[PDB]
Ligand binder design. Structure first.
Ligand SMILES: NC[C@@H]1O[C@H](O[C@H]2[C@@H](O)[C@H](O[C@@H]3[C@@H](O)[C@H](N)C[C@H](N)[C@H]3O[C@H]3O[C@H](CN)[C@@H](O)[C@H](O)[C@H]3N)O[C@@H]2CO)[C@H](N)[C@@H](O)[C@@H]1O
Lengths: 49, 272
RNA sequence: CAUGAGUAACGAUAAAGAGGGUGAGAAUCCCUCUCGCCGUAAGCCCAAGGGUUCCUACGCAAUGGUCGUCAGCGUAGGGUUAGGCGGGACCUAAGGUGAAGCCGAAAGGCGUAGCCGAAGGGCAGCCGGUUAAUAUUCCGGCCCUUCCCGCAGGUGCGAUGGGGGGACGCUCUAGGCUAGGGGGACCGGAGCCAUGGACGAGCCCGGCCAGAAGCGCAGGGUGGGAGGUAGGCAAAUCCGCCUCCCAACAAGCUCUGCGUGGUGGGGAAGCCCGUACGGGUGACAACCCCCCGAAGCCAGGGAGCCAAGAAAAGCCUCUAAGCACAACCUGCGGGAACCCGUACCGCAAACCGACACAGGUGGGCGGGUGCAAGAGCACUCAGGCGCGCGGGAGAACCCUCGCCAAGGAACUCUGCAAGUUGGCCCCGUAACUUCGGGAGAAGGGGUGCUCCCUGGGGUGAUGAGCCCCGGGGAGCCGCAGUGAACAGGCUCUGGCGACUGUUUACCAAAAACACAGCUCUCUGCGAACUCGUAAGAGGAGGUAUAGGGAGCGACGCUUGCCCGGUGCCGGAAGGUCAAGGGGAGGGGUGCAAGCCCCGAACCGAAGCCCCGGUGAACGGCGGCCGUAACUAUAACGGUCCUAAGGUAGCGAAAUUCCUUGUCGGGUAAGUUCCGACCUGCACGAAAAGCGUAACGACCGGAGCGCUGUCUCGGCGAGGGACC
RNA sequence: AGGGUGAAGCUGGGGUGAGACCCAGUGGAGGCCCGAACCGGUGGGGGAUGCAAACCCCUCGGAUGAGCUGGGGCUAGGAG
């Protein structure tokens, strides 16, 4: 029932990653923001395998 | 290698009024040719209705002759491309290399013709206007020399030689007008190759049209949320407007357009 | 922390019952025995994605929707290794990046080239055996792969730049091989009659799989020269252009069948033991014969038809320049070859829905019998289960499903539903028609199984070897003979719409929108628009038979009356006004040259006024009065009014309120529909008008057929309800 | 998956001048027609704190095309 989930090691992994974030200025910006504003990490790190 | 126009399927349910055409060279093209991207979307914003595709070949054709202005060529033969309003002749240049070129009035496979500095005014060769035997026919024709075959009268059997003046000769172009081109410029001799095509009949629209590649257009399409015109009702609106914030369909476009007066007159119209 | 509540609920009506076992306790664990449901899936398989877990050993207080000594649960330990499988160590498209370059207030926008970037390209192995556990990765048998060192033989060798070349629809399709079906009493084998019978071409099991190349089936992919060799595809013998010969069902060079070296496996029972995961196990095999064959493979076929089907290795082919004495082509010897990957789940309790949620999620025959054909049907093969809460009587009543008679729609807003009806073969088939068709019209009749005479397309002629109907004849047994499961109810008729379709994810199967095809009309390509801050792309490598704006929407007949207002199209003679150019002139300060305002005669851009044009352009197309031997209107009979004043067809309609209009038909009766009439509350051709076959999960009106549907239904089975 | 339909071309036989054009055989095209896997989802029915934040059943339409589908991408949110 295409509940829209079903991720893709590829696609998802792909679309999102350190690189990518640093690429788009918004990406980067939000990056640091979150990053040290409140610790955590980065789902663009979330990645598996 | 000409082509039948008229063959029409018959009563194979509503596949009715389907017109076939068959160039006899039937060979699959040759060596020189890449392909086109999937434009319709472009410069990556998206634009202009219809648009869909359907299979994929994609052309490269000669548009410039002064590049050998002489090496007779003999019709390699007939054939065409997933583009153009009137087939082509893959021609062979006596020097070895060949080139996809026009396809004027039914010439003939193996026929020799060429062009340049004086070509015999035999539909097929091409020449700098100037060699214009005023009262004759060509197409492909290009004003502003070098600017390549400019005015590729598609299946446009239309370049009618009409007198000359100054460094410009007068021409009657499809449209139903007369412009001017400095003689040294050029013209493919004779006329086009297709028209009946233009009359072709195709069955169940969806089927055909789409196959064409193009999908749709649907005006004042109810919910005029946009669709310029009215909707949310039967009735055809009033204002007198078109899609994407339009001016109806009876107003200019030209301007100073240094272009305009610069040549041509007849102004834009016909009367069949 | 209470409450309905110890009622509702346990995730599918694919059922389970026994015996023994282990246990502190076993409906709910283990074996084994009866039994039902899958099987075309509840099969296995690759992949995805999950990422623990998988196993083996202990344990269950949490977790499973209670169990629970069971687990995918908890604790610990061990478990996947590949030059030849895959992906990178290579290729590239879309496509992202981007040295250049064009471009922004900035952040960026655009971007060739080179790069990144694919189960799209390309590339060198297979099978049999061994672990609790992984395998073409391990072992073993068999078959190779490139790269390095050498040597041996052989050459204008020597880029990746030129080229040729790999490269490609769809529909279909001859010919040829295993897969893979299938009968061999055909050979090997462990057994049996239990029961009236048969030990007899009886049953039951099996009767292969891989094999350098050597070779024998099929074909599967073409030219030798020479020369001119005014292109070369810049640089040169390689391609392509011209010419004279040989251009042979030609030798050419790339997958099957045999090979066969040869290895390996080899199952029924059967009974001995482990829970099982399992193993001995018969010589241990017999391992031959004949049948049917594909959408698979050879194969880049072959034909036909348009909407006419991707870019980088490999073979050559020259510079660089080396080579040519140590470059490449080719044998043998020697020596090399790393990075990331497997466990298992994996049409699903481990992947996605917050749950062991009956939802969804990509490709691989899909074993067999029967059915005309077939992944549908019914029973099954292997292989998979028994959905995880149980026992119990079984009343109300909803559910699911079965039977009815009498009548057979009156129920009812609607025959909603449900039943009728449906499998192929022959008899036969209406108004209308775009002569394609409405026909599966419609209405009949058929089939089962026996024996008998009679023709055929298979397979090495053709003789136990099979598939097509034969055909006909006599006859057999049922109420019953597509015998069960797959499987049309039908006819008449009217409004719309053409018909194929998409959608409205969340009611709204269907009109609307599509549309093919009509007309107006826009644009000269550096078109016109569409996004854009330029840049720029788009558009179109298209180039007015073309690319846009549109109202319509096959087709047939047919598109009439007005442009006085509106928009748009055409002409600036004139009236008209911004800035401006501008100077008359007034002005303040100036003792004064002067310095500085205000400044307005006249010239002055589109526009606006004005004059024509103008409907498949907005948008509209009338009002009243009078007269032909009489009793009824009709012709103008002139007038009031405006731009004229609605034609053709059309009418109480997906527009008539007076309306259940009036007649007619249908009918026991009908505001329902069909047909008329036509004083059209308020139709009219282009947002089309009248009509118009085929086609609709269209909406509405008849009527035949059939049917617990209705006159109430009445009993019945399965599930909760209830103990 | 599977089955029926049965155009165009052609081949031959038939009639003029040849020809139209006919008949027959071949053929075996898209529409498709019939109907599963595939894709949609009315018509009726069955849950209401339901297997479920859109389901199960009986049923039904397309069932080669504007078809359906896995992988890889671009357009996006006053924009698509
Ligand atoms: N040739 C005309 C023919 O007859 C008619 O003409 C019509 C039209 O022209 C004319 O219209 C005119 C117009 O001034 C305006 N509508 C007011 C005027 N009363 C009227 O005239 C009317 O009244 C007249 C005097 N009492 C009579 O002649 C007659 O009843 C009638 N014509 O009158 C006719 C009916 O309205 C048909 N309409 C037409 O199709 C057909 O061709």
């Amino acid at each position: 029932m295409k509940r829209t989930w079903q991720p893709n090691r590829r696609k998802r992994a792909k679309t999102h990653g350190f690189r990518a974030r640093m690429r788009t200025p918004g990406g980067r910006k939000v990056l640091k923001r979150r990053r040290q504003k409140g610790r955590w990490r980065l789902t663009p790190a979330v990645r598996k395998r | 290698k000409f082509k039948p126009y008229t063959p029409s399927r018959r009563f194979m349910t509503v596949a009715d009024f389907s017109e076939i055409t068959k160039t006899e060279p039937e060979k699959s093209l040759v060596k020189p040719l890449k392909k086109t991207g999937g434009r319709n979307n472009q410069g990556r914003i998206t634009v202009r209705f219809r648009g869909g595709g359907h299979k994929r070949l994609y052309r490269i054709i000669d548009f410039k002759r002064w590049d050998k202005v002489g090496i007779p060529a003999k019709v390699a033969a007939i054939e065409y491309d997933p583009n153009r309003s009137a087939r082509i002749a893959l021609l062979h240049y006596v020097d070895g290399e060949k080139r996809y070129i026009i396809a004027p009035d039914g010439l003939q496979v193996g026929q020799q013709v060429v062009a340049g500095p004086d070509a015999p005014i035999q539909v097929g060769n091409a020449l700098p206007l100037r060699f214009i035997p005023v009262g004759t026919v060509v197409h492909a024709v290009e004003l502003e020399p070098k600017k390549g075959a400019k005015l590729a009268r598609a299946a446009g059997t239309s370049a009618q030689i009409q007198g000359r003046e100054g460094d410009y000769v007068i021409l009657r172009l499809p449209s139903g007008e007369l412009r001017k081109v400095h003689g040294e410029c050029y013209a493919t001799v004779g006329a086009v190759g297709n028209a009946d095509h233009k009359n072709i009949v195709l069955g169940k629209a969806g089927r055909s049209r789409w196959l064409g590649r193009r999908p749709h257009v649907r005006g004042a399409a109810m919910n005029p949320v946009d669709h310029p015109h009215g909707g949310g009702e039967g009735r055809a609106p009033r204002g007198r407007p078109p899609a994407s914030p339009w001016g109806w369909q009876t107003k200019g476009l030209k301007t100073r357009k240094r272009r305009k007066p610069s040549s041509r007159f007849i102004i834009a119209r016909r009367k069949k």
